């Protein structure tokens, strides 16, 4: 695994998490996508759906840098 996938890098991701207030205890990975996606949602992605699409797939992103790194449990 490339230098962006450590435990050094994932520590960077789940600070930045717990920073936005998103990652919370026994966290699965649709969860924190939903809550990412949510601190995004407002004038943009209300008013643009293209740009409501894409703060979705970056949250769904994330969810899942997250999940390889070990923060949020897979999907059921
Ligand atoms: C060990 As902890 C406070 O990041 O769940
Ligand atoms: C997987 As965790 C949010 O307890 O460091
Ligand atoms: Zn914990
Ligand atoms: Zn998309
Ligand atoms: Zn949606
Ligand atoms: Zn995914
Ligand atoms: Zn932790």
Same mark, same amino acid.
């Given at each position: 695994?490339?230098?962006?996938?450590?435990?050094? #890098?994932? =520590?960077? &991701? @789940?600070? +930045?998490?717990? #920073?936005? =207030?998103? &990652? @919370?205890? +026994?966290?699965?990975?649709?969860?924190?996508? @939903?809550?990412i996606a949510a601190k995004g949602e407002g004038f943009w992605t209300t008013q643009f759906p293209q740009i409501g699409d894409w703060n979705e797939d970056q949250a769904a992103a994330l969810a899942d840098r997250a999940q390889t790194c070990g923060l949020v449990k897979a999907d059921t």
């Amino acid at each position: 695994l490339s230098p962006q996938y450590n435990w050094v #890098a994932c =520590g960077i &991701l @789940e600070g +930045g998490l717990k #920073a936005a =207030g998103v &990652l @919370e205890e +026994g966290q699965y990975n649709r969860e924190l996508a @939903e809550a990412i996606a949510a601190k995004g949602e407002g004038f943009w992605t209300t008013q643009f759906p293209q740009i409501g699409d894409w703060n979705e797939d970056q949250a769904a992103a994330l969810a899942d840098r997250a999940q390889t790194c070990g923060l949020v449990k897979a999907d059921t």
